[PDB]
CSV table of C-alpha atoms in Angstrom, one decimal:
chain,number,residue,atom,x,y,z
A,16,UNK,CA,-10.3,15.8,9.4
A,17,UNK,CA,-11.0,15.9,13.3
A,18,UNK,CA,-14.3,13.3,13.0
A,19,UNK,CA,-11.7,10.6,12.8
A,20,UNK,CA,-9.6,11.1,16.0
A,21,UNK,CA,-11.4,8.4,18.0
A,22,UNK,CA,-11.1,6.0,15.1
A,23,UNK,CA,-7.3,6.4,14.7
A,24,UNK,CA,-6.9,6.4,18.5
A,25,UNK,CA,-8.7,2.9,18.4
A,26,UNK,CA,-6.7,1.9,15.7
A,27,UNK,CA,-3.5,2.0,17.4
A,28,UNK,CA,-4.8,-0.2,20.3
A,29,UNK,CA,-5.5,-2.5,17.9
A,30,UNK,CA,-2.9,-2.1,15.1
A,31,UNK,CA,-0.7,-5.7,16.3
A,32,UNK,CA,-3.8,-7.7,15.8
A,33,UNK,CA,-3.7,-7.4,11.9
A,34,UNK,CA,0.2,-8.3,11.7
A,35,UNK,CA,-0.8,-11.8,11.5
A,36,UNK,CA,-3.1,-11.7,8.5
A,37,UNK,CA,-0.9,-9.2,7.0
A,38,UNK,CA,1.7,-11.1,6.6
A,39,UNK,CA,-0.3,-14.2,5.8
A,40,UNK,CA,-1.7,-12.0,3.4
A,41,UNK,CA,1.9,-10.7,1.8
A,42,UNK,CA,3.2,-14.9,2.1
A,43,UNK,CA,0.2,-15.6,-0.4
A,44,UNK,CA,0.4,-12.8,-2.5
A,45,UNK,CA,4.2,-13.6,-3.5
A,46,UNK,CA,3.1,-17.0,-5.4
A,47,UNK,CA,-0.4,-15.2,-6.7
A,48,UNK,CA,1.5,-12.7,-8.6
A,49,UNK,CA,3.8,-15.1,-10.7
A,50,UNK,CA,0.2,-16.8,-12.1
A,51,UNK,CA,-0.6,-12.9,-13.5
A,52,UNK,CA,3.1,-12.2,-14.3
A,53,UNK,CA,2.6,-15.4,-16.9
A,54,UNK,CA,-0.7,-14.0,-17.5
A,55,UNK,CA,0.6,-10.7,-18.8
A,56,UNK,CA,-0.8,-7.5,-18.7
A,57,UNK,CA,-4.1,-8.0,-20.7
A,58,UNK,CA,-4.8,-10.8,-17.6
A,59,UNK,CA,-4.2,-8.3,-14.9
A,60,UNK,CA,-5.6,-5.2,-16.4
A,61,UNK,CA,-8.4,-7.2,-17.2
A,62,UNK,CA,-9.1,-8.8,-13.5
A,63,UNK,CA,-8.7,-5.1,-11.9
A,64,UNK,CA,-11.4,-3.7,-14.2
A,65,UNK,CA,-13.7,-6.9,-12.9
A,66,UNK,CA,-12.9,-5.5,-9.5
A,67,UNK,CA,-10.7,-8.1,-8.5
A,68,UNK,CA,-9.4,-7.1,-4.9
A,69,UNK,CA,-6.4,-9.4,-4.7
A,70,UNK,CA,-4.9,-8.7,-8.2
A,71,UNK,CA,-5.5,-4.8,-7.5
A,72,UNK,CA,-3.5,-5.4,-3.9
A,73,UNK,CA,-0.9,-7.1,-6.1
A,74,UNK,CA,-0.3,-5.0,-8.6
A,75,UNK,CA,0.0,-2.3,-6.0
A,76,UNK,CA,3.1,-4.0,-3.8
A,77,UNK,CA,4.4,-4.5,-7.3
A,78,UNK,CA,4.6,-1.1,-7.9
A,79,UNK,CA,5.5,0.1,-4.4
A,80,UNK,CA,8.3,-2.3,-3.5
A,81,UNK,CA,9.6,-1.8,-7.7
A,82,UNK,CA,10.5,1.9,-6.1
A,83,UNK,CA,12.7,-0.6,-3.5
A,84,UNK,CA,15.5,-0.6,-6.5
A,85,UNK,CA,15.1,3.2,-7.6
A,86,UNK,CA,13.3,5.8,-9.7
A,87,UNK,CA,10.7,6.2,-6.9
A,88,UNK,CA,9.1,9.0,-9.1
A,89,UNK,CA,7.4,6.9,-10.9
A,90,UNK,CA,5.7,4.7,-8.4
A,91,UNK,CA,4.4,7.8,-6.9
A,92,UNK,CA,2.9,8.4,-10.3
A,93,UNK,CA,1.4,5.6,-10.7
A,94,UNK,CA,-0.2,4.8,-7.2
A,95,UNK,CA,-1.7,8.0,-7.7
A,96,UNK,CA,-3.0,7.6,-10.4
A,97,UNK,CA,-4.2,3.9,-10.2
A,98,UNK,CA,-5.5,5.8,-7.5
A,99,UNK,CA,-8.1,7.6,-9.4
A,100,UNK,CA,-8.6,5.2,-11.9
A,101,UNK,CA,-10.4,2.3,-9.7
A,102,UNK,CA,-13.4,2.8,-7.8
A,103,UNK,CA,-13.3,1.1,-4.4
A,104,UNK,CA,-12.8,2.8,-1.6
A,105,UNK,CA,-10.6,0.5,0.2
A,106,UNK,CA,-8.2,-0.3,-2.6
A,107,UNK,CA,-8.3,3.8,-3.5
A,108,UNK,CA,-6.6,4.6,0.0
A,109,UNK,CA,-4.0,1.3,0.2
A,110,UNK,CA,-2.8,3.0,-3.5
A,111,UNK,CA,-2.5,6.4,-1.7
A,112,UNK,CA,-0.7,4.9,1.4
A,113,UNK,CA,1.9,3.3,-0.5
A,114,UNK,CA,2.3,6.7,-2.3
A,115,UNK,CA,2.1,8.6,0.6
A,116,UNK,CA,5.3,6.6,2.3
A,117,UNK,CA,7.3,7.2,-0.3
A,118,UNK,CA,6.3,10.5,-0.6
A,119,UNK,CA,7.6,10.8,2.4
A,120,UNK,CA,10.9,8.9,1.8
A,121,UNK,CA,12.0,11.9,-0.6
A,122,UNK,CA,10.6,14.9,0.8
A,123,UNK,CA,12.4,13.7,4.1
A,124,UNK,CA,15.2,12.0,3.3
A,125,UNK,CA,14.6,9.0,4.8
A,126,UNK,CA,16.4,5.6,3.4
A,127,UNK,CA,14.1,2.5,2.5
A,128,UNK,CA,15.8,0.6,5.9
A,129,UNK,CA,15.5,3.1,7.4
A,130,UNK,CA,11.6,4.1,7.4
A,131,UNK,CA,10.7,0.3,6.1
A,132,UNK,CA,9.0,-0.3,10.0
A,133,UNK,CA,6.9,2.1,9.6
A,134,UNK,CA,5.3,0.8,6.7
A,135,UNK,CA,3.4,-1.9,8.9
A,136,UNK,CA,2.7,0.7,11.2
A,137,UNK,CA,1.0,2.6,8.9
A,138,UNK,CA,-0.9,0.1,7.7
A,139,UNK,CA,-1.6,-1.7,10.6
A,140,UNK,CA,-3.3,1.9,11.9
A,141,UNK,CA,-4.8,3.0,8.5
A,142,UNK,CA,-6.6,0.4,7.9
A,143,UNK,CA,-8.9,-0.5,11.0
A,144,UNK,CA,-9.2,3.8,10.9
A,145,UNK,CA,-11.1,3.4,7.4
A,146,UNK,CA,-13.0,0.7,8.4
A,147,UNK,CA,-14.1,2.7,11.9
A,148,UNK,CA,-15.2,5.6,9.4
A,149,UNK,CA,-16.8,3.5,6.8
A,150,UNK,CA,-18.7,1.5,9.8
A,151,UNK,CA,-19.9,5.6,10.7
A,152,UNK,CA,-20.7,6.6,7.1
A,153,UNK,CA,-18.0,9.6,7.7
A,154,UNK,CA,-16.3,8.0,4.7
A,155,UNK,CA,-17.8,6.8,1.4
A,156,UNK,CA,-17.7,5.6,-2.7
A,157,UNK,CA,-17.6,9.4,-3.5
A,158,UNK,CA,-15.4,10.9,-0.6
A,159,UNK,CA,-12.5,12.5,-2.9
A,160,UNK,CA,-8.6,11.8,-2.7
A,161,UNK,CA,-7.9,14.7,-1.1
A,162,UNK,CA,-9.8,13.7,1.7
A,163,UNK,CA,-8.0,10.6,1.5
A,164,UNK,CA,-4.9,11.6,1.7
A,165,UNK,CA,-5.5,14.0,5.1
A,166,UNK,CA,-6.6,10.9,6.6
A,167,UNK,CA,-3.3,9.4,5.6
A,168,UNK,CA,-1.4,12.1,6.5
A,169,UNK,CA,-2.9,12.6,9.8
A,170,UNK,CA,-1.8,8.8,11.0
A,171,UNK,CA,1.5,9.5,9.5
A,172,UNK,CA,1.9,13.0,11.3
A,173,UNK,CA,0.7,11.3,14.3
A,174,UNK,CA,2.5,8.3,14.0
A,175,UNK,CA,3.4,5.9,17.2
A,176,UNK,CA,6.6,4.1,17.6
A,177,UNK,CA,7.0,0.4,15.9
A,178,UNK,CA,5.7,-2.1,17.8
A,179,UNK,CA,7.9,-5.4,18.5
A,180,UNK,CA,5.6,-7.8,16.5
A,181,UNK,CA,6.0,-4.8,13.6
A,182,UNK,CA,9.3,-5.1,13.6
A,183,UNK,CA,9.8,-8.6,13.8
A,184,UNK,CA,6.8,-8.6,11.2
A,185,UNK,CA,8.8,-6.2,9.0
A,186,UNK,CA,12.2,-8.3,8.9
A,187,UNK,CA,10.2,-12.0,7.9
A,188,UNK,CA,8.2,-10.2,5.2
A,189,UNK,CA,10.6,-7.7,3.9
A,190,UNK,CA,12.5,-9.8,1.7
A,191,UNK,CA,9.7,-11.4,0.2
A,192,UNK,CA,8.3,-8.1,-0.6
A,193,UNK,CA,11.0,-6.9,-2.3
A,194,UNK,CA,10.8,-10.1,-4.7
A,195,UNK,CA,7.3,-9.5,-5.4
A,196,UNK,CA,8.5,-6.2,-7.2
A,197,UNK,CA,11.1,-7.8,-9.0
A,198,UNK,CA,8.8,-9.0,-12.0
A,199,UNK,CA,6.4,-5.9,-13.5
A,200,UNK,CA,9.1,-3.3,-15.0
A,201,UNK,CA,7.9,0.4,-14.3
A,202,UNK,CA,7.5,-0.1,-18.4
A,203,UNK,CA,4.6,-3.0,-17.8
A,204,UNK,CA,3.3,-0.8,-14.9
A,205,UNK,CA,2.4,2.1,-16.6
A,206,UNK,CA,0.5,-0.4,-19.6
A,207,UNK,CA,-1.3,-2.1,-16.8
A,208,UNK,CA,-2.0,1.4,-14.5
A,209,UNK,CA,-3.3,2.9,-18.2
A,210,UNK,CA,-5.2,-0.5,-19.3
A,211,UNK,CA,-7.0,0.2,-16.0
A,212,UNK,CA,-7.9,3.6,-16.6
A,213,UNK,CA,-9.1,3.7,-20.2
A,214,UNK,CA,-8.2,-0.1,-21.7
């Protein structure tokens, strides 16, 4: 709180310049996932707990954008607590972002087409703003979730307008998105979330 209000100012002036390796990023992650979803659970719980970065940023689009067709309950529940279960910092507060936006969603009443701009905003922001306080030690392996969270909450409270490349961003990557959550039934989600906490 407070010690990161140059670092999210920053990140705003630079927020467009990860659009294109985000959704480079989201383009590769749509064929990735169907190698694991023949895998099965074992294969990802099993890559997550090796600290695999790219299945653990798969799994969690796969349980954010599964919230797309309903029952957003429970992919609160379990980006929270994937959230606690793994250990790096970085993959600890994208699980609490996609949380946090739909957190938002129902405590607001805001419809998925409706907020679905701001999810690259967010991102695009909340992610150069970790790696300005990691870079300055503020954050760290053992900063808690709750300290997480205000981080996330304070972009969100503070959150600028969509940019253009955002939004035209937001309507090439949005339906592939939505695919990628198609596969992984909240059912196989809560085997893989509790394989990765105690399987």
């Amino acid at each position: 709180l407070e010690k990161a209000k140059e670092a999210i100012k920053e990140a705003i002036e630079n927020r467009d310049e990860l659009v294109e390796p985000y959704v480079e990023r989201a383009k590769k992650l749509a064929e990735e996932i169907k190698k694991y979803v023949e895998g099965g659970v074992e294969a990802i719980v099993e890559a997550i707990k090796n600290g695999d970065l790219e299945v653990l940023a798969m799994l969690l689009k796969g349980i954010f954008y599964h919230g797309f067709y309903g029952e957003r309950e429970e992919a609160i529940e379990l980006l929270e607590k994937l959230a606690k279960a793994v250990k790096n910092l970085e993959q600890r507060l994208m699980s609490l972002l996609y949380a946090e936006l739909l957190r938002y969603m129902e405590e607001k009443g805001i419809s998925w087409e409706e907020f679905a701009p701001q999810y690259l905003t967010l991102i695009t922001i909340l992610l150069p703003t970790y790696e300005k306080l990691k870079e300055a030690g503020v954050v760290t392996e053992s900063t808690s979730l709750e300290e997480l969270r205000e981080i996330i909450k304070l972009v969100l409270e503070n959150l600028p307008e969509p940019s253009e490349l955002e939004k035209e961003a937001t309507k090439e990557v949005e339906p592939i998105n939505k695919k990628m959550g198609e596969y992984l039934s909240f059912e196989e989600l809560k085997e893989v979330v509790e394989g990765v906490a105690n399987g």
